[PDB]
Design an enzyme around this catalytic site. Structure first.
Site, PDB file in Angstrom:
ATOM      1  N   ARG A  50       0.881  -1.157   0.000  1.00 29.59           N
ATOM      2  CA  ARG A  50       0.000   0.000   0.000  1.00 29.59           C
ATOM      3  C   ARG A  50       0.921   1.210   0.000  1.00 29.59           C
ATOM      4  O   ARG A  50       1.747   1.379   0.897  1.00 29.59           O
ATOM      5  CB  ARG A  50      -0.962  -0.056   1.193  1.00 29.59           C
ATOM      6  CG  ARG A  50      -1.887   1.148   1.219  1.00 29.59           C
ATOM      7  CD  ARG A  50      -2.987   0.924   2.228  1.00 29.59           C
ATOM      8  NE  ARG A  50      -3.957   1.981   2.386  1.00 29.59           N
ATOM      9  CZ  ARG A  50      -4.014   2.891   3.365  1.00 29.59           C
ATOM     10  NH1 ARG A  50      -3.109   2.888   4.342  1.00 29.59           N
ATOM     11  NH2 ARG A  50      -5.017   3.751   3.394  1.00 29.59           N
ATOM     12  N   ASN A 127      -7.496   7.849   1.998  1.00 29.98           N
ATOM     13  CA  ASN A 127      -7.273   7.297   3.331  1.00 29.98           C
ATOM     14  C   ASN A 127      -8.202   7.914   4.373  1.00 29.98           C
ATOM     15  O   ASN A 127      -8.430   9.127   4.381  1.00 29.98           O
ATOM     16  CB  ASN A 127      -5.849   7.666   3.793  1.00 29.98           C
ATOM     17  CG  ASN A 127      -5.458   7.049   5.125  1.00 29.98           C
ATOM     18  OD1 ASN A 127      -5.142   7.697   6.152  1.00 29.98           O
ATOM     19  ND2 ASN A 127      -5.467   5.745   5.170  1.00 29.98           N
ATOM     20  N   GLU A 128      -8.778   7.103   5.245  1.00 33.06           N
ATOM     21  CA  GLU A 128      -9.573   7.518   6.409  1.00 33.06           C
ATOM     22  C   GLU A 128     -10.236   8.855   6.175  1.00 33.06           C
ATOM     23  O   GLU A 128      -9.936   9.841   6.825  1.00 33.06           O
ATOM     24  CB  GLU A 128      -8.564   7.640   7.563  1.00 33.06           C
ATOM     25  CG  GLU A 128      -7.893   6.321   7.902  1.00 33.06           C
ATOM     26  CD  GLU A 128      -6.924   6.337   9.050  1.00 33.06           C
ATOM     27  OE1 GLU A 128      -6.676   7.438   9.596  1.00 33.06           O
ATOM     28  OE2 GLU A 128      -6.432   5.254   9.453  1.00 33.06           O
ATOM     29  N   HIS A 196      -9.811  -0.001   9.225  1.00 33.98           N
ATOM     30  CA  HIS A 196      -8.533   0.229   9.896  1.00 33.98           C
ATOM     31  C   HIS A 196      -8.721  -0.103  11.381  1.00 33.98           C
ATOM     32  O   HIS A 196      -9.615   0.461  12.005  1.00 33.98           O
ATOM     33  CB  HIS A 196      -8.040   1.653   9.734  1.00 33.98           C
ATOM     34  CG  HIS A 196      -7.661   2.001   8.332  1.00 33.98           C
ATOM     35  ND1 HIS A 196      -7.101   3.216   8.029  1.00 33.98           N
ATOM     36  CD2 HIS A 196      -7.745   1.319   7.163  1.00 33.98           C
ATOM     37  CE1 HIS A 196      -6.861   3.275   6.728  1.00 33.98           C
ATOM     38  NE2 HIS A 196      -7.240   2.137   6.179  1.00 33.98           N
ATOM     39  N   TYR A 198      -7.375  -0.060  15.054  1.00 31.91           N
ATOM     40  CA  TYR A 198      -6.478   0.409  16.110  1.00 31.91           C
ATOM     41  C   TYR A 198      -7.153   0.263  17.467  1.00 31.91           C
ATOM     42  O   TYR A 198      -7.762  -0.796  17.724  1.00 31.91           O
ATOM     43  CB  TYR A 198      -5.965   1.784  15.780  1.00 31.91           C
ATOM     44  CG  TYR A 198      -5.041   1.857  14.584  1.00 31.91           C
ATOM     45  CD1 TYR A 198      -3.698   1.510  14.708  1.00 31.91           C
ATOM     46  CD2 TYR A 198      -5.524   2.233  13.343  1.00 31.91           C
ATOM     47  CE1 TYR A 198      -2.845   1.580  13.616  1.00 31.91           C
ATOM     48  CE2 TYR A 198      -4.679   2.319  12.246  1.00 31.91           C
ATOM     49  CZ  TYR A 198      -3.355   1.994  12.392  1.00 31.91           C
ATOM     50  OH  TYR A 198      -2.502   2.069  11.315  1.00 31.91           O
ATOM     51  N   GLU A 225      -5.403  -1.290   7.357  1.00 30.91           N
ATOM     52  CA  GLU A 225      -4.390  -0.900   8.309  1.00 30.91           C
ATOM     53  C   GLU A 225      -4.705  -1.548   9.658  1.00 30.91           C
ATOM     54  O   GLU A 225      -5.871  -1.692  10.010  1.00 30.91           O
ATOM     55  CB  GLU A 225      -4.315   0.600   8.620  1.00 30.91           C
ATOM     56  CG  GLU A 225      -3.915   1.533   7.519  1.00 30.91           C
ATOM     57  CD  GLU A 225      -3.659   2.961   7.965  1.00 30.91           C
ATOM     58  OE1 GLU A 225      -3.493   3.270   9.180  1.00 30.91           O
ATOM     59  OE2 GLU A 225      -3.634   3.799   7.019  1.00 30.91           O
ATOM     60  N   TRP A 249       0.462  -1.499   9.229  1.00 27.52           N
ATOM     61  CA  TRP A 249       1.064  -0.153   9.176  1.00 27.52           C
ATOM     62  C   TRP A 249       2.234  -0.156  10.152  1.00 27.52           C
ATOM     63  O   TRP A 249       2.011  -0.476  11.328  1.00 27.52           O
ATOM     64  CB  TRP A 249       0.024   0.911   9.598  1.00 27.52           C
ATOM     65  CG  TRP A 249       0.595   2.310   9.553  1.00 27.52           C
ATOM     66  CD1 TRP A 249       1.349   2.925  10.516  1.00 27.52           C
ATOM     67  CD2 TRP A 249       0.476   3.247   8.474  1.00 27.52           C
ATOM     68  NE1 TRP A 249       1.728   4.178  10.088  1.00 27.52           N
ATOM     69  CE2 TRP A 249       1.197   4.403   8.846  1.00 27.52           C
ATOM     70  CE3 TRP A 249      -0.149   3.221   7.225  1.00 27.52           C
ATOM     71  CZ2 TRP A 249       1.332   5.516   8.019  1.00 27.52           C
ATOM     72  CZ3 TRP A 249      -0.019   4.326   6.401  1.00 27.52           C
ATOM     73  CH2 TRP A 249       0.709   5.464   6.791  1.00 27.52           C
TER      74      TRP A 249
END
Length: 297
Positions: A50, A127-128, A196, A198, A225, A249
């Site tokens: 990516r 992205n995001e 993603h 986290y 991610e 990531w």
């Protein structure tokens, strides 16, 4: 012509072989001097990279010749190339962020270097693309559908990868509840959703519930991610169990207090951090589970 595409909720190469992404992100825009990373990432077994690009809104634009070079580096190293515009990050909350529409303007500017590369390149639109501001998070589905429509109208046949709101983590479950609407808006069906993971995903129950919602509904999904306080052991195990792609990531060069997400130290391919050892060489990791895309053989 179409290359990588979606059928029955899963990602396939044009020959009909399923493709399960096992890769990492590389911060190309911020570290253009480190083009050796493509070979280094391949040497540890990844099948996809990516690539962080900019449309010029927050960072310096990666022009057509630069993007052509990136694509050639992916191809030379037998890697599928997922290109992404990073400037959209946190729109609605982050000052100076790009809209999805400005990301699409840039993709269209690159049309001549991207057309004909559908077997090798995935386009991650932005992205995001939303932070947590409620008024703008509420526009995720309509803005995302509009961007897909603009790209298809401009003749793009690539598989498109779309990110969630709430800084990619979708803790409002906006993408989860509205992905069906967005998927319907792509005439070709070649759209993949990306979550993603986290700190919202520190519990195994939340991870499993989110992933199974997409698999059970036939909505294509990748973990675009993830870090390591997310439960990386469960994320990697569930991605293997459900046969979902994942992208960690990141290769190296993190700043902003997220230094611990470097997989290797100072872009040295032979100097892995504990995180690099975990994602490439630990259980359900890249080296043991990744298969090279068959388009290269």
């Amino acid at each position: 012509a179409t290359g990588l595409h979606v059928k029955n909720g899963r990602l396939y190469e044009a020959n009909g072989q399923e493709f399960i992404i096992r890769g990492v992100s590389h911060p190309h825009n911020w570290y253009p001097q480190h083009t050796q990373a493509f070979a280094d990432i391949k040497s540890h077994g990844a099948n996809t990279v990516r690539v962080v690009l900019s449309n010029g809104v927050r960072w310096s634009k990666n022009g057509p010749s630069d993007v052509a070079n990136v694509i050639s580096l992916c191809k030379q190293n037998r890697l599928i190339c997922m290109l992404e515009v990073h400037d959209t990050t946190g729109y609605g909350e982050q000052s100076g962020a790009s809209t999805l529409d400005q990301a699409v303007d840039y993709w269209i500017e690159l049309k001549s270097v991207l057309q004909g590369e559908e077997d090798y390149v995935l386009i991650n639109i932005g992205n995001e693309p939303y932070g947590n501001d409620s008024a703008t998070v509420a526009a995720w589905a309509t803005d995302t559908s509009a961007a897909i429509q603009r790209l298809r109208a401009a003749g793009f046949e690539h598989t498109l990868v779309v990110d969630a709101p709430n800084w990619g983590q979708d803790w409002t479950n906006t993408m989860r509840n509205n992905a069906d609407q967005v998927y319907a808006s792509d005439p070709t069906g070649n759209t993949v959703f990306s979550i993603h993971m986290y700190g919202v995903y520190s519990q195994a129950s939340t991870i499993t519930s989110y992933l199974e919602h997409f698999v059970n509904a036939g909505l294509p999904l990748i973990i675009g991610e993830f870090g390591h306080n997310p439960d990386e052991d469960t994320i990697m195990a569930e991605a293997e169990r459900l046969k979902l792609g994942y992208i960690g990531w990141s290769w190296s060069g993190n700043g902003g207090g997220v230094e611990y997400l470097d997989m290797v130290y100072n872009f040295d391919g032979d100097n892995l951090s504990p995180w690099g050892e975990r994602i490439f060489y630990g259980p359900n990791g890249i080296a043991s589970t990744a298969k090279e895309a068959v388009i290269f053989g």
